[PDB]
Amino acid sequence: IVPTRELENVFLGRCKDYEITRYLDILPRVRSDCSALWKDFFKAFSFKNPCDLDLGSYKDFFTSAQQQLPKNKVMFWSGVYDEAHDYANTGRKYITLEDTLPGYMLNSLVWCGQRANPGFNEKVCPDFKTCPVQARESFWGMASSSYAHSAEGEVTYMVDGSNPKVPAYRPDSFFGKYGLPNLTNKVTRVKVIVLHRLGEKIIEKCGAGSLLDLEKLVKAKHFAFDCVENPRAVLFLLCSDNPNARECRLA
Amino acid sequence: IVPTRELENVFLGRCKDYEITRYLDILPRVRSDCSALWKDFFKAFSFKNPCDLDLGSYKDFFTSAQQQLPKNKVMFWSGVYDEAHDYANTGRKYITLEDTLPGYMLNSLVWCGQRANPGFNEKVCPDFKTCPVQARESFWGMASSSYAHSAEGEVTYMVDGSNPKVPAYRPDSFFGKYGLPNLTNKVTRVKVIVLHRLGEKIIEKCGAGSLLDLEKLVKAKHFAFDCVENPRAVLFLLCSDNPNARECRLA
Numbered sequence: 119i120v121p122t123r124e125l126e127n128v129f130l131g132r133c134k135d136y137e138i139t140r141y142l143d144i145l146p147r148v149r150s151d152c153s154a155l156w157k158d159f160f161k162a163f164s165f166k167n168p169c170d171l172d173l174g175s176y177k178d179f180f181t182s183a184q185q186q187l188p189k190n191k192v193m194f195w196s197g198v199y200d201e202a203h204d205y206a207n208t209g210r211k212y213i214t215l216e217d218t219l220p221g222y223m224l225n226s227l228v229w230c231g232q233r234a235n236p237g238f239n240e241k242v243c244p245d246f247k248t249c250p251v252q253a254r255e256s257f258w259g260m261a262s263s264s265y266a267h268s269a270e271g272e273v274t275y276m277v278d279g280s281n282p283k284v285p286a287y288r289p290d291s292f293f294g295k296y297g298l299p300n301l302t303n304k305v306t307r308v309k310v311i312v313l314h315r316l317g318e319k320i321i322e323k324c325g326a327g328s329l330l331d332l333e334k335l336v337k338a339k340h341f342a343f344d345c346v347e348n349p350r351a352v353l354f355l356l357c358s359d360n361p362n363a364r365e366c367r368l369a
Numbered sequence: 370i371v372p373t374r375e376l377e378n379v380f381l382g383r384c385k386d387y388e389i390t391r392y393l394d395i396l397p398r399v400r401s402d403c404s405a406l407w408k409d410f411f412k413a414f415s416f417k418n419p420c421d422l423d424l425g426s427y428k429d430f431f432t433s434a435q436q437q438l439p440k441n442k443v444m445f446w447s448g449v450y451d452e453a454h455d456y457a458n459t460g461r462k463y464i465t466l467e468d469t470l471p472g473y474m475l476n477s478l479v480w481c482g483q484r485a486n487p488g489f490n491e492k493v494c495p496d497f498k499t500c501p502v503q504a505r506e507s508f509w510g511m512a513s514s515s516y517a518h519s520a521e522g523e524v525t526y527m528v529d530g531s532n533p534k535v536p537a538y539r540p541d542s543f544f545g546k547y548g549l550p551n552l553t554n555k556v557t558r559v560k561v562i563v564l565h566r567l568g569e570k571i572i573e574k575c576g577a578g579s580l581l582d583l584e585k586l587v588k589a590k591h592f593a594f595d596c597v598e599n600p601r602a603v604l605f606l607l608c609s610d611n612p613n614a615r616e617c618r619l620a
């Protein structure tokens with residue numbers, strides 16, 4: 119894959135933008151300045167082969183970068199990037215990882231280490247399905263752990279209930295592996311929202327299949343659990359993009 | 370009013386973020402680099418009293434910053450910021466001024482010139498109600514004109530149809546003064562979307578009142594014209610935030 123151009127300039131430009139202007143009434147500022155944060159991010163992978171990473175690599179960066187998160191507002195998602203972010207509505211209804219400082223700075227970017235100066239590969243990065251599991255998941259897995267550990271009160275999890283190749287919930291997704299196990303006693307409830315894509319076969323249902331496995335897990339942690347398929351608020355967002363869909367007919 | 374801190378760093382940070390990562394398949398890049406744009410911008414207002422700006426002050430800045438705009442996707446909005454940006458969908462369905470480079474860079478920011486070094490005031494700015502209209506409007510007014518001038522094909526205009534105190538179309542709004550007067554013959558049609566807020570009394574309707582004045586003005590510019598109230602796709606977006614409103618009942 120093609121690495122992000124001007125990585126340091128982009129990281130630093132997003133960081134300063136976020137610091138001064140973004141999520142001011144939703145998330146707290148971090149103590150560390152943008153240059154300290156860059157130093158922690160870069161040392162996680164620089165001057166190393168591109169797959170020489172593990173879950174501990176970005177430890178200092180995520181420590182510096184972590185924010186206290188709004189109680190009852192944390193959301194996770196798997197398989198539903200646009201619908202989850204459209205619904206969270208840039209922190210107004212829920213926070214996603216990608217609205218927090220480390221998530222916002224690195225969202226959509228591509229980078230990797232190399233041993234030779236300048237310590238990072240400006241030409242090519244591995245498909246990363248290519249590196250071993252602990253390396254491929256080093257950055258977003260630590261991102262997910264740290265974010266989960268900071269969640270408080272009700273947490274929401276949006277999943278795709280219409281994908282015949284990928285269960286709504288799986289033990290090895292970033293949420294499965296780094297989210298749920300890292301929810302603490304500050305969390306009171308996991309609220310699942312199952313998306314049923316308009317015009318598509320329903321594959322997964324609350325109370326059955328992988329959602330029942332998730333339910334059992336949630337309860338084993340002593341959180342409450344609820345699950346809803348296409349709640350009206352989410353259904354109308356879907357309809358907005360597909361207003362003639364059968365599901366959208368009004369009275 | 371307190372000005373944005375670290376204005377230069379914010380502007381440049383936003384400009385680098387946008388250049389490398391934002392609207393990449395939706396809007397073109399600008400030839401000027403971020404440093405050159407900052408110089409143009411700073412030059413427009415600095416070492417002048419804030420009440421001495423006019424519609425020419427940022428002319429050179431907008432000249433450098435102006436992107437060619439995708440045919441048929443240009444949208445104007447009045448009194449409906451959140452609804453218009455949610456519907457426009459960060460450039461995917463429509464472009465707004467706030468998705469373009471200069472609008473993105475200065476959106477929400479607050480700044481002012483001053484006569485002493487360093488030529489701008491980093492700590493306090495005058496409420497703009499104290500200055501002449503042409504100075505209050507010098508930046509966003511030139512922004513809207515430049516943006517209007519670049520529009521081609523069908524343009525869309527989203528208006529509030531449910532304010533008893535503020536007509537859907539006013540000659541003295543930004544669209545009235547800087548948007549419509551500045552549409553060229555590359556524009557073929559103005560399409561009006563009238564927003565009726567859920568649970569509010571309907572004030573304005575297509576073909577009547579200020580909307581008929583606007584219809585007549587558009588036609589006298591030889592643009593085609595159409596007008597809709599709460600088109601399904603827009604209504605569904607409203608409904609997502611108020612699913613239990615009467616207007617949102619499903620079949």
Ligand SMILES: NC(=O)c1ccc[n+]([C@@H]2O[C@H](COP(=O)([O-])OP(=O)(O)OC[C@H]3O[C@@H](n4cnc5c(N)ncnc54)[C@H](O)[C@@H]3O)[C@@H](O)[C@H]2O)c1
Pocket residue numbers: 193194195196197198199214215216225226247258262290291292293294
């Ligand atoms: N913003 C990001 O780039 C990003 C990346 C990973 C994880 N996360 C966080 O963790 C959760 C999403 O991750 P998840 O695994 O639960 O859901 P998911 O399966 O939707 O994965 C999210 C990202 O990981 C990649 N991915 C997913 N399946 C893949 C596959 N089998 N092969 C190769 N790449 C694949 C995709 O690029 C996708 O953008 C969210 O809460 C999110 O905040 C975010």
